[PDB]
Write a protein of this length. Structure first.
Ligand code: FAD
Ligand code: FAD
Ligand code: GDU
Ligand code: GDU
Lengths: 392, 392
C-alpha cells in the first residue's frame, strides 16, 4: 500500500533541484524529478565546446551572485566558486564604454572627467523630467536614474531589441536590476557574494540531484506521464516549475514572454573582444550582446589560437518556444492574477505548487529562485510532508 | 656567560619582521629588533584618520599581491585579506582613462573601439622604433610595450615627476612593473593572490612581531646603540635593512634615491574621485597621484559626509630624508657594486647581513621583500644559527 514517491517535481532547474535536494536530504523522502529536456539544470545547463574545451552556457551567460548568506552557504555544498567578478562593456557608435552607470560611463560619453559630485549634478539635471519615486515604467525609471541622454544612448535601443515592447509598458524593476553608481566601480552586480562554478554549472547541478532518493527522468513531459505517476503516489504533492499559462492549456489566454536564439561560433583567433560580455546598444545590429566564454574563466588556461563566441538574439516566444523572460505588461499582470487564482485552486484540489521563473511568471535570477525554493520548502512543503499541514 | 640575544635586526619593515619572526618562532631564538622610527612596519605602517576612521597608509598606498603561494600562506598567518583588486585610473588632459595598457585605454585614447587583434596591430606599428628584447632603458621598453603615442601621454610626464631623471637613464624594469594587456582587464597587478589586510597593516605587522622572543625597540638608531648591544651578544649576527650607502657613512659616495612627501586632507564631501588611486600623468600638476583611502575598503562602511585624500609628491632624497625609491642609473649601479663588495666584507668580518629595499638598493614590493627575507632565512641565517654554518 506504499506510494512509490513522496514528491513530484516538474523541471530540473535550480528551483526544482533545490526543492528535490532539500526534501530528499532533510526529510528522507523520495523525489521524482521530471525534465522535459535531454539534460538537467534548466537554462543553467552548460557544456564544453569540443575544439577549445571552453565551457559554454547553452542558454545564455549565467553569472551567480547573491547577498543572501544562507543561499551562499547552501550552494557551496554542491560547488566551489571562482573569484570572477562580472563586468559588462557597452558598444555604442563604434566605441566601447564602461558600464553600467558610473564615472567611467559618464566621463567617456560626455567627453571629460566628472567628479562624483559633478556627475551627480549632471545626471540630476538630465533626470529632471521624472523622479525615481514617481517612476512607473522602465523608461521613466531609467531616465530618473541615469538621465535622458544616457537612457537614449544605452537603454532605449537595447530595450527595443530585448523586449520589442514600449518602454512605457515595461516594469521599472527591469532597469533597476542594474547598479546606479557615481564611482569608477563597474561591477555589473552589487551583491556581497559572486562567482562562477569552478567545475562548471552542469557539475554543480548534478551534485544537487546526486542524492540516491532523487530520481531524474530526462526527456519526460509531465503532462505525458502525470496520469500514470500520481496514482502510484496519490498523497505526493507536485511542484511545477514550467510555464504557468501552459499548465492550464492557455485557458485564460497567453502570457507575454520573450525567448532567445543563440549563434555559437568558434573563431580562429584567440580573443574576439577582450571581455566576457559586450552589450550592443545600437539598433544597427540584430543581437543584444556577445558572450566570449574564455573570459569567464581566466584561471583556466585555454588555447590561444581559437575562441568561442555567442551572439544573442531576442524575440517573442511562440506556441512551442521555450520562454526565457516574462514581459509583465499591465495586461500580462492582469492575466497572471487569473492564473494565480487558478494556481491557488490547483494547490487546494490537487496539491500542486507553483514555483520558479516560469511557474510564477517572475524575472528570477538564480539566487532568487533558490531562495524562493528554500522559502517554499521551509514554509509550505516541509510542514506538509513532515507534519501533515495543508499546502495553503 | 650568555648572550642577551641570538640576533639583531635593524629595521621593523616587512623584511626585518619576517626575519625576526622566522628566527624567533622556528629556531626558538631571541631577536632584538631596532627601529629608528616611533612605530614598526616601516613604510607599510598605517593609521586610522580620527574624523572618518578611515585607515591611511602613511607612507603611500600599500597594495599586497603575489604569485608566490609560500608567501601567500605565510602572511595569512598574521592577517586576513579582503577581496580588494587594485585598479588605477589615469588623468590626462581633463579626461580619466582606464589603465594600464589594454583595450580600455586604447579605445579611449584613440577615440574608437579596437578589437584585441586591431589593438595589437596598432601598438605594433607605434612600437616599431624599438623591440622589447632590444630595450635597455625605461623609455625604450615603454615605447616597445605600449607604443610612442601612449608613452608620451601616460609615461613620459609621470616618469618626469616621479624620477626627475632622463627616461633613457632609468631601468627598463621600472615600466615592466605594469601589466601590458590587450583585453579590457584593468587590474593593476597580474599576480595570483591579492588583497588588503582586513584589520589594517599595523595589526598585521604587530602580529608578526608579537612573539615574546621578539623585542622591538622604537626610536632607536642602530648606529647609536650597536657599540653597546653587540658586546652583550658577540656571536649574534646583524640583519641590516636600512640604506646601504648610509651604513658605510657614504664612504664611496651617495646612491641616488627618490623620496616622497604627502599632503593628507580630509574633505567635507563623501567622495572625491570615485576610486582608490588616480594617477596624474600631466606635468601641469605637481603631484604624481591622489589616493582616496575609503575606496580601498568598500566592505567597511564609512561616513559619507567626509573623505580622506592624499596627494603624492616626489623629489630627490637629501642627506636626512628617508629614501623610498632606488633610482638605479648606470652610475648608481656602479656605486652599488662597490657597496655590495663592502657588504660582503661586513658579512665576513662582523656577521652583518644586508636585506630589504634599502639594504640592497632594490625596487622591492612587499611580497618580494618577504620572499627575499624567507630566502635569507632558509639559506643563510637558519643554517648559521642552528647548524653553525658561516654566513658567506
Ligand atoms: C539569458 C539568461 C541569462 C541569465 N543570467 C543569469 C545570471 O547571470 N545570474 C543569475 O542569477 N540568473 C541568470 N538568469 C536566470 C536563471 O536562468 C533562472 O533563474 C534559472 O533558470 C532558475 O531556474 P527556474 O527552475 O526558476 O527556471 P528554469 O531553470 O528555466 O527551470 C525550468 C525547467 O522546467 C522544465 N520544464 C518546463 N516545463 C516542463 C514540463 N511540462 N515537463 C517537464 N519539465 C518541464 C524545463 O525543461 C526547464 O528545465 C539568466 C537567465 C537567462 C534566460
Ligand atoms: C609609496 C610606496 C608605495 C608602495 N606600494 C606597494 C604596494 O602597493 N604593494 C607592494 O607589495 N609594495 C609596495 N611598496 C613597497 C614596500 O613599501 C616595501 O617593499 C616594504 O617597505 C618592504 O620592507 P623593507 O623592510 O625591505 O623596507 P622598509 O619597510 O622601508 O623597512 C626599513 C626600516 O628600517 C628602518 N631603519 C632604517 N635605518 C635604520 C637605522 N639606522 N636604525 C634603525 N632602523 C632603521 C626604517 O625605519 C624602516 O622602518 C610601496 C612603497 C612605496 C614607497
Ligand atoms: O545595456 C543595457 C543593459 C540592460 N538594459 C536594460 O536593463 C534590463 C536588464 O538588463 P540585464 O542585463 O539584467 O538583462 P538580462 O536579464 O538579460 O541580463 C542577463 O545578462 C547579463 C550579462 O552580463 C547578466 O548575466 C545578467 O544578470 C543576466 O540577467 C534589460 O532588459 C534592458 O532593458 C539596457 O537597457 N541596456
Ligand atoms: O601612470 C603611470 C604609472 C607608472 N608609470 C611608470 O611606471 C613606473 C612604475 O609604476 P608604479 O605604479 O609601479 O609606481 P610605484 O612604485 O610608485 O607604484 C606604487 O603605486 C601604485 C598605486 O596604485 C601601486 O600601489 C604600486 O604597486 C606601487 O608600487 C613608474 O615609475 C613610472 O615610471 C608611468 O609612467 N605612468
Amino acid at each position: 500500500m506504499t506510494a512509490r514517491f513522496d514528491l513530484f517535481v516538474v523541471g530540473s532547474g535550480f528551483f526544482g533541484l533545490t526543492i528535490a535536494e532539500r526534501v530528499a536530504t532533510q526529510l528522507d523522502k523520495r523525489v521524482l524529478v521530471l525534465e522535459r529536456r535531454p539534460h538537467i539544470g534548466g537554462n543553467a545547463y552548460s557544456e564544453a565546446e569540443p575544439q577549445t574545451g571552453i565551457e559554454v552556457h547553452k542558454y545564455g551567460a549565467h553569472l551567480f551572485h547573491t547577498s543572501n548568506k544562507r543561499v551562499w552557504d547552501y550552494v557551496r555544498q554542491f560547488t566551489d566558486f571562482t573569484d570572477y567578478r562580472h563586468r559588462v562593456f557597452a558598444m555604442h557608435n563604434g566605441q566601447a564604454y564602461q558600464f553600467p552607470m558610473g564615472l567611467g560611463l559618464v566621463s567617456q560619453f560626455f567627453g571629460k572627467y566628472f567628479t562624483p559630485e559633478q556627475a551627480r549634478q549632471l545626471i540630476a539635471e538630465q533626470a529632471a523630467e521624472i523622479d525615481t519615486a514617481d517612476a512607473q515604467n522602465l523608461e521613466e525609471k531609467a531616465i530618473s536614474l541615469i538621465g535622458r541622454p544616457l537612457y537614449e544612448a544605452f537603454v532605449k535601443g537595447y530595450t527595443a531589441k530585448q523586449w520589442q515592447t514600449d518602454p512605457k509598458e515595461l516594469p521599472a524593476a527591469n532597469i533597476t536590476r542594474l547598479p546606479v553608481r557615481y564611482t569608477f566601480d563597474n561591477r555589473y552586480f552589487s551583491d556581497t557574494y559572486e562567482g562562477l562554478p569552478t567545475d562548471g554549472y552542469t557539475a554543480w547541478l548534478q551534485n544537487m540531484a546526486a542524492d540516491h532518493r532523487i530520481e531524474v527522468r530526462l526527456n519526460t513531459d509531465w503532462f505525458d506521464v502525470r496520469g500514470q505517476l500520481r496514482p502510484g503516489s496519490p498523497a505526493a504533492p507536485v511542484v511545477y516549475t514550467g510555464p504557468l499559462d501552459r499548465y492550464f492549456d492557455y485557458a485564460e489566454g497567453r502570457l507575454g514572454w520573450r525567448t532567445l536564439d543563440f549563434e555559437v561560433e568558434v573563431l580562429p583567433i584567440g580573443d574576439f573582444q577582450g571581455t566576457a560580455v559586450m552589450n550592443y546598444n545600437d539598433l544597427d545590429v540584430p543581437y543584444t550582446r556577445i558572450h566570449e566564454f574564455r573570459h569567464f574563466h581566466p584561471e583556466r588556461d585555454y588555447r590561444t589560437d581559437k575562441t568561442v563566441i555567442m551572439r544573442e538574439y531576442s524575440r517573442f516566444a511562440e506556441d512551442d518556444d521555450e520562454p526565457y523572460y516574462p514581459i509583465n505588461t499591465e495586461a500580462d499582470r492582469a492575466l497572471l492574477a487569473t492564473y494565480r487564482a487558478r494556481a491557488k485552486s490547483e494547490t487546494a484540489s490537487s496539491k500542486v505548487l507553483f514555483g520558479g521563473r516560469l511557474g510564477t511568471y517572475q524575472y528570477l535570477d538564480m539566487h532568487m529562485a533558490i531562495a524562493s525554493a528554500l522559502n517554499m520548502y521551509d514554509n509550505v512543503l516541509a510542514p506538509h510532508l513532515r507534519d501533515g499541514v495543508p499546502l495553503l
